Design a protein around this ligand. Structure first.
Ligand SMILES: CCCCCCCC/C=C/CCCCCCCC(=O)OC[C@H](O)CO
Ligand SMILES: CCCCCCCC/C=C\CCCCCCCC(=O)OC[C@H](O)CO
Ligand SMILES: CCCCCCCC/C=C\CCCCCCCC(=O)OC[C@H](O)CO
Ligand SMILES: CCCCCCCC/C=C\CCCCCCCC(=O)OC[C@H](O)CO
Ligand SMILES: *C\C=C(C)/C=C/C=C(C)/C=C/C1=C(C)CCCC1(C)C
Length: 230
């Protein structure tokens, strides 16, 4: 392929595909209703990402957006992926702590605003307005991070020890990895253009695989996903 970033899109496609297959074989035979919920949510995440990394590799999920004079290559398929996978990841954390319906709706709604305004900012043609949408999307993300710390952590500390310890590890992983996304976007091709697209694609690939495959490896190997039975 003539695009220098193709090597990272192909590695991303392969790793998401291998991750999906591993979780699929692993979830076979699980009869506990609670564990089936976590396996279903956690296997769909890499399956969706696989299809959208493939679409970028083949060129379907790419568009040209004029801003700053030149034509800029914008991979819109990322936002179709994140629209469906980031809510599912939040659902994994909320069900682990047995969150209430009201708090779950708050997280999913703010997540939808995060991704939706990020997409609008990505396709905006007036350069200075791109950063207005970036700001609003980052405000929605800070609300999500606030709820995970000053809401879920308080309840996790009144549950089973395995639930509290597993949640604390996954909460920490989420806060660090998610926080990197607005930074890469800001200095990358969608924003200031300080980092070239080939390096930007490499960074997102490392973050995406860690946040979906690595996240799932820690969750599905813990005993917190199974109900307390004899
Ligand atoms: C799990 C085990 C795997 C661990 C893997 C962790 C690696 C993460 C990669 C990071 C960024 C790489 C940045 C490389 C930047 C190269 C850009 C460059 O030097 O270009 C020069 C330019 O032409 C003139 O300034
Ligand atoms: C090279 C391989 C490429 C990557 C693979 C192609 C992915 C796209 C195809 C299919 C969906 C397959 C099923 C995905 C849904 C899994 C949900 C699940 O397994 O849930 C378990 C639960 O316990 C049950 O009751
Ligand atoms: C818990 C529920 C799980 C639900 C899981 C649902 C997964 C469907 C996701 C993705 C493939 C992306 C489809 C993107 C559609 C693009 C359509 C299109 O045509 O692009 C616009 C324009 O027309 C182009 O030229
Ligand atoms: C908790 C998560 C926080 C997420 C939100 C954190 C936002 C702060 C980021 C960036 C401003 C960086 C500088 C912007 C000005 C760009 C002009 C410029 O000087 O280029 C960059 C320079 O070469 C090299 O720093
Ligand atoms: C599939 C993996 C994860 C962790 C995806 C995370 C995506 C975000 C946290 C997106 C953040 C954005 C914000 C807050 C502002 C700029 C636009 C983005 C959509 C990249």
């Amino acid at each position: 392929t003539g695009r220098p970033e193709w090597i990272w899109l192909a590695l991303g496609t392969a790793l998401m595909g291998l991750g999906t297959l591993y979780f699929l074989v692993k979830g076979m035979g699980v009869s506990d209703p609670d564990a089936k919920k976590f396996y279903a949510i956690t296997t769909l995440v890499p399956a969706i990402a696989f299809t959208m990394y493939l679409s970028m590799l083949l060129g379907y999920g790419l568009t040209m957006v004029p801003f700053g004079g030149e034509q800029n290559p914008i991979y819109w398929a990322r936002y179709a992926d994140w629209l469906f996978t980031t809510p599912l990841l939040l659902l994994d954390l909320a069900l682990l702590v047995d969150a209430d319906q009201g708090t779950i709706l708050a997280l999913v709604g703010a997540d939808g605003i995060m991704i939706g305004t990020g997409l609008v900012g990505a396709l905006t043609k007036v350069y200075s307005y791109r950063f207005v949408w970036w700001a609003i999307s980052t405000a929605a993300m800070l609300y999500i991070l606030y709820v995970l710390f000053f809401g879920f952590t308080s309840k996790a500390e009144s549950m089973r020890p395995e639930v509290a310890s597993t949640f604390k590890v996954l909460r920490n992983v989420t806060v660090v990895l998610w926080s990197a996304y607005p930074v890469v976007w800001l200095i990358g091709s969608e924003g200031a253009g300080i980092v070239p697209l080939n390096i930007e694609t490499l960074l997102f690939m490392v973050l995406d695989v860690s946040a979906k495959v690595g996240f799932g490896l820690i969750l599905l190997r813990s005993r917190a996903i199974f109900g307390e039975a004899e």
